């Protein structure tokens, strides 16, 4: 009931009591653990008020005014709004608190040490696709800060009935296109081959190359979505070069600077924000391991091994491992030499351990998903590999949601 | 109730129904996932018969004779033995079946594709420490097969009352010693510093070097344990050299060929075998990542980076990642050039995926612990990283047990 997590590299123990405030369900049972399943699985006023009260009770507890008259009046004020309107509206302060704690509670995020320095852009007055584009352009420009990347979120109107949803149909604001070929192979990013098609079905004219930035597909208030091109001056890109291998430039790789997730749902006080793009900075391995070396993404270990003059016959020559490291030295060096913010999996995992220590002290724990927190290379020479972690669902939270093209009434 | 696991690199889906036969508990609840906790947590005749029947019902189902007279008579025969003796004895066939399925059911083992080719040595007639030594020497000689390693297990008498336990106090039959120093640092393997002391307290005379093979501390029938030196001709070792770097020989590293776990408990039909050493062959990363590069083990990334002429100032130069790969190319090359059996994390993880496919087809699933199955380097360029896995506890099984020095009445 008051569980213990141990670190097996330092023999450090921490006691978790925050998991008592956990609410949602994990997918695991007493007889089965699903902690490696990727996606485990209209709101009414009956459910809304307990969720609002639970959220408000922790908000007012956070500003040192638990249960005061200002608290009780806001509780009644919201209770009466849910009675009248069958929903309610967050104060700006509550919105910023809510957003910051959805990040704080993101168990799959290794970067949460930064959770309190989030810039929240309130876009709940938006009504059109064009307004979303404008709001999203300002988000991009701010978060990029000329390479001095700053974390931020832009929050579009909450879900009302269900058929009037604000949605960014892109999974990230900046992604490269994926084109299949007549010979079956893929140009660009295979991940986005389907979304790259949908843009064309809606009228996008593709430059059909490698690193072609996709347009935005913005759906406002349930209406059919619309295409907008992000001004290229707003899309910062880093060309990937190596500090030793000069042939690495001829690989002609590059990546975008701003990681900005746009397909998730923000839950605050039982209110659902279906469009809530949020951005930080990359850990190098996201690019240099997954984006570049997944078999089903850019898949470059092939060429990189070739140019290094590697034994590619035997699997046991570790030619894949050796080329994977060079690629990540180059992603980091390129970003740093350009002064674009990035963190290596060593610094980032060390910071999460120190974050964890801060959380258990001043909060009673920190939900953490080991499967996602451990980096995709060199796992056990980073400190989080040896750190036991308890995973549980706290609110406010970011949640997955269906891709909007599978659920949307059209025209 | 009939769950689905997905592979996110191949889009392959498999349906798990074997988890219905799961029995023990995982430590997880509907509200908390503990799949990253390392160790989550006298038998009477009331509990023994359901466990015996459940085991016998699956044994006789495995030889195509479910519920026959030969089955029903064995059920009654065991029921009457548990009535008379408050325990029972397995047939040799049932012992071999039991042992093979404890391996098959080992969710943290990536090598299970081999589970049916296990050599089972029945040592239930053993009565003395010296007998254990003899049985264990024959196990070592057989499993090593001059480097053509063969999987095997030796099974000492089952637990009767509790104070008459057979125990191998070593955690592995072959381990290197760990000596602290006057200046605090450690010589050899820091993992075994405590056990290396216990041997001395019992009278071991240490050659106090690096790779000094520890003696065996064998406890028979509850009596105080006794020290035996494995004949050095029986302990096969590989010196670690690199196929490119000739200075790598001067590192003077070497490792033993035979991985042989001796501190776990084998459960079959509700009977507990407290001494049951079992052995296979190494995956290279067990040596070259964990044993060699854990901060709390040999910790060699220091020197290896030095001799490679690496940028060791910045963390983001990935000098640790680069040296980690070289060390694992060398472990593999050394073992192979000596014809000592070993598997690289690529071949081994590929084989486990194909094992998984075999299991789901002919068995309805395969319990698997993602946290342990993914190798400690290059995680996502191996296929198991992208494979969802369901973890659950099947019996027969290998279980953890307390270290015997913490629990043993002495003299
Ligand atoms: C500022 C630096 C940040 C770093 C270094 C970082 C690091 C990471 C990494 C490596 C992942 C795993 C992504 C993947 O493997 O696909 C992740 C996931 C995640 N990030 Fe963070 N992140 C940062 C900022 C943020 C911010 C500002 C938010 C929200 C406001 C956020 C919310 C999340 C969530 C909810 C997930 C997991 C959900 C999912 O992606 O499936 N992150 N982060
Ligand atoms: C034959 C080749 C084998 C390979 C390549 C292999 C591979 C592995 C690896 C890499 C681990 C993780 C160990 C660690 O990280 O400390 C492991 C664990 C395990 N192995 Fe296998 N193994 C093999 C044979 C066997 C055999 C013959 C048995 C039993 C009869 C067995 C039972 C287990 C169990 C029960 C565990 C997990 C329990 C624990 O170690 O905590 N293995 N194996
Ligand atoms: C804000 C942010 C920062 C960062 N450094 N990285 C991310 C990546 C999140 C990937 N999610 C889940 C996987 N999904 C396939 C794509 C979306 C987000
Ligand atoms: C039979 C076998 C083969 C193999 N290749 N590897 C192993 C290692 C098992 C490590 N276990 C758990 C961790 N524990 C600290 C030590 C004992 C066993
Ligand atoms: C904290 C975590 O449970 C612990 O470090 C685990 C992680 N995964 C592992 N996986 C394997 N194969 N072996 C281990 O010792 C561990 N250690
Ligand atoms: C099967 C498994 O759930 C899946 O491949 C996960 C594993 N861990 C991950 N960890 C991170 N950070 N990102 C991912 O996409 C994944 N994928
Ligand atoms: Zn779990």
- Atom of ligand 3 lying closest to residue A260 CA: 1
Q: How was this structure determined?
A: X-ray
Give Cβ neighbours of residue B267 (< 8 Å, ≥ 6 apart).
Answer: B102, B273, B395, B396, B397, B398, B399
A340 is in an annotated binding site: no
- Report d(CA A321, CA B111) in Å as an integer: 21
Cα–Cα–Cα angle for B48, B53, B58, nearest 5°? Answer: 135
Name the H helices within A311-411: 319-337, 345-363, 370-373
B319 is in an annotated binding site: no
Exposure b/e, B21-45, CB count within 10 A at least 16 = b? ebeeebbbbeebbbbbbeeeeeeeb
- Report d(CA B169, CA B195) in Å as an integer: 8
Query: Is the minimum distance from the CB of A34 to ligand 6 under 6 angstroms?
Result: no
**C-alpha of B102 from chain center:** 11
The residues facing B216 across adjacent strands are B228
Answer yes or no: are the C-beta atoms of B300 and B292 closer than 8 Å. yes
Q: Does B34 touch chain A (CB under 8 A)?
A: yes
CA of A323 relative to ligand 3 center, distance in Å: 24
List of E strands, B73-123: 119-122
- Report d(CA B381, CA A285) in Å as an integer: 12
Are residues A294 and B391, on separate chains, in Cβ contact within 8 Å? no
- Which residue's alpha carbon is at the smallest distance from atom 15 of ligand 4? B171
List of E strands, A141-215: 152-155, 167-168, 178-180, 186-188
Q: Which residues from chain A sit within 8 angstroms of residue B335, using beta carbons?
A: none
Q: Which of B167, B186, B166 is nearest to B176 (CA)?
A: B186
Query: Is the minimum distance from the CB of B385 to ligand 6 under 6 angstroms?
Result: yes
Answer yes or no: are the C-beta atoms of A260 and A279 closer than 8 Å. yes
CA torsion angle for A75, A78, A80, A81 (degrees, to 10)? 180
The residues facing B255 across adjacent strands are B238
Q: Does B3 touch chain A (CB under 8 A)?
A: yes
- Report d(CA A137, CA A126) in Å as an integer: 14
**Catalytic residue positions of A?**
109, 112, 281, 286
- Which residue's alpha carbon is at the smallest distance from atom 16 of ligand 5? B372
- Report d(CA B32, CA B43) in Å as an integer: 30
Header resolution in angstroms? 1.8
Helices B45-62 and B69-85 meet at what angle, rounded to 10?
A: 160
Q: What percent of the residues of chain A are helix, what percent strand, and what percent coil, each to the nearest 5?
A: 40, 15, 45
For the record, the structure tokens of A92 come out as: 């700006």
Give Cβ neighbours of residue A281 (< 8 Å, ≥ 6 apart).
Answer: A111, A149, A151, A257, A258, A259, A341, A342, A343
- Report d(CA B99, CA B398) in Å as an integer: 9
Answer yes or no: are the C-beta atoms of A330 and A247 closer than 8 Å. no
Per residue, the 3-state secondary structure of A294-333, as one string, reads CCCCCCCHHHHHHHCCCCCCCHHHCHHHHHHHHHHHHHHH
Strand duo B216-219 + B226-228: pairing: antiparallel
Nearest neighbour of A33 by CB, restricted to B28, B321, B347: B28
Query: Is the minimum distance from the CB of B8 to ligand 6 under 6 angstroms?
Result: yes
- Best residue among A193, A261, A264, A372 to mutate for probing ligand 3's pocket (most ligand atoms within 8 Å of CB) is A261
Give Cβ neighbours of residue A229 (< 8 Å, ≥ 6 apart).
Answer: A215, A216
- Report d(CA A197, CA A187) in Å as an integer: 13
Nearest neighbour of B9 by CB, restricted to A37, A295, A380: A295
Query: Is the minimum distance from the CB of A171 to ligand 3 under 6 angstroms?
Result: yes
Residue B402, classified by CB atoms within 10 Å of its CB into exposed (0-12), middle (13-18) or buried (19+), is exposed
Residue B96, classified by CB atoms within 10 Å of its CB into exposed (0-12), middle (13-18) or buried (19+), is middle
Query: Is the minimum distance from the CB of A283 to ligand 1 under 6 angstroms?
Result: yes
- Cis ω for the linkage preceding A396 (within 30 of 0): yes
Q: What does residue B223 show for φ and ψ, rounded to 5 degrees?
A: -65, 160
Q: Which residues from chain B sit within 8 angstroms of residue A318, using beta carbons?
A: 325, 328-329, 332, 344
- Atom of ligand 2 lying closest to residue B153 CA: 30
A282 is in an annotated binding site: yes
- Report d(CA A361, CA B312) in Å as an integer: 33
- Report d(CA B90, CA B76) in Å as an integer: 14
Query: Is the minimum distance from the CB of B386 to ligand 6 under 6 angstroms?
Result: yes
- Atom of ligand 4 lying closest to residue B264 CA: 17
Are residues A9 and B37, on separate chains, in Cβ contact within 8 Å? no
Residue B131, classified by CB atoms within 10 Å of its CB into exposed (0-12), middle (13-18) or buried (19+), is middle
Q: Does B222 touch chain A (CB under 8 A)?
A: no
Give Cβ neighbours of residue B338 (< 8 Å, ≥ 6 apart).
Answer: B147, B238
Give Cβ neighbours of residue A317 (< 8 Å, ≥ 6 apart).
Answer: A310, A311, B329
- Report d(CA A330, CA B324) in Å as an integer: 17
For the record, the structure tokens of A10 come out as: 């330092």
CA of A362 relative to ligand 5 center, distance in Å: 28
The residue of A305, A321, A372 whose CB has the most chain B CBs within 10 angstroms, and thus the best one to mutate to test that interface, is A321
Q: Does B154 touch chain A (CB under 8 A)?
A: no
Q: Does B339 touch chain A (CB under 8 A)?
A: no
Are residues B318 and A324, on separate chains, in Cβ contact within 8 Å? no
Q: Which of residues 267-296 of B touch A (CB under 8 A)?
A: 284, 289-290, 293-296
DSSP one-letter string for A65-119: -TT-HHHHHHHHHHHHHHHHHSS----HHHHHHHHHHHHHT-TT-TTGGGTTS-E
Q: Which of A217, A133, A212 is nearest to A176 (CA)?
A: A212
Stated as kind and residue range, the H or E segment containing B165 is none
Cα–Cα–Cα angle for A345, A351, A356, nearest 5°? Answer: 125
Q: Write the DSSP symbol of residue B158.
A: P
Give Cβ neighbours of residue A386 (< 8 Å, ≥ 6 apart).
Answer: A7, A8, A9, A10, A380
For the record, the structure tokens of B242 come out as: 């690199």
Residue A186, classified by CB atoms within 10 Å of its CB into exposed (0-12), middle (13-18) or buried (19+), is middle
- Report d(CA A218, CA A168) in Å as an integer: 5
For the record, the structure tokens of B110 come out as: 């990536």
């Amino acid at each position: 009931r008051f569980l213990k997590v141990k670190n097996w590299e330092t023999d450090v123990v921490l006691t978790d009591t925050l998991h008592l405030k956990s609410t949602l369900e994990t997918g695991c049972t007493e007889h089965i653990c699903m902690g490696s399943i990727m996606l485990p699985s209209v709101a009414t006023k009956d459910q809304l008020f307990p969720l609002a009260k639970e959220f408000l009770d922790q908000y007012y507890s956070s500003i040192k005014r638990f249960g005061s008259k200002a608290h009780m009046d806001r509780l009644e004020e919201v209770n009466k709004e849910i009675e009248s309107t069958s929903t309610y509206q967050l104060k700006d302060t509550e919105l910023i608190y809510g957003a910051k704690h959805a990040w704080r509670n993101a168990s799959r995020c290794v970067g949460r040490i930064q959770w309190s320095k989030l810039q929240v852009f309130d876009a709940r007055d938006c009504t059109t696709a064009h307004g979303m584009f404008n709001y999203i352009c300002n988000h991009v420009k701010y978060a990029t800060n000329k390479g001095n990347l700053r974390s931020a979120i832009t929050i579009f109107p909450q879900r009302t009935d269900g058929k009037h949803d604000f949605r960014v149909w892109n999974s990230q604001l900046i992604r490269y296109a994926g084109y299949k070929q007549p010979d079956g192979s893929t140009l660009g990013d295979p991940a986005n081959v389907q979304f790259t098609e949908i843009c064309i079905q809606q009228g996008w004219k593709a430059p059909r190359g490698r690193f072609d930035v996709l347009p935005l597909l913005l759906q406002a208030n349930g209406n059919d979505p619309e295409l907008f091109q992000i001004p290229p001056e707003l899309v910062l890109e880093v060309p990937i070069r190596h500090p030793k291998f000069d042939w690495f430039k001829d690989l002609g790789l590059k990546w975008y600077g701003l990681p900005a997730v746009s397909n998730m749902l923000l839950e605050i006080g039982g209110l659902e924000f279906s469009a809530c793009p949020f951005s930080g900075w990359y850990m190098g391995t996201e690019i240099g391991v997954r984006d570049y070396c997944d078999n089903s993404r850019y898949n470059i270990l092939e060429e990189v091994a070739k140019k290094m003059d590697l034994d590619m016959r035997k699997t046991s020559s570790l030619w894949k491992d050796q080329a994977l490291v060079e690629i990540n030295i180059a992603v980091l060096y390129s970003f740093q030499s350009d002064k674009v913010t990035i963190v290596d999996h060593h610094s980032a995992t060390e910071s999460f351990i120190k974050h964890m220590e801060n959380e258990y002290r001043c909060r009673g724990g920190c939900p953490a998903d080991w499967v996602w927190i451990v980096p995709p290379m060199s796992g056990s020479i980073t400190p989080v590999f040896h750190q036991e972690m308890l995973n549980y669902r706290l609110t406010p939270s970011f949640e997955y949601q269906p891709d909007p093209w599978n659920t949307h009434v059209w025209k």
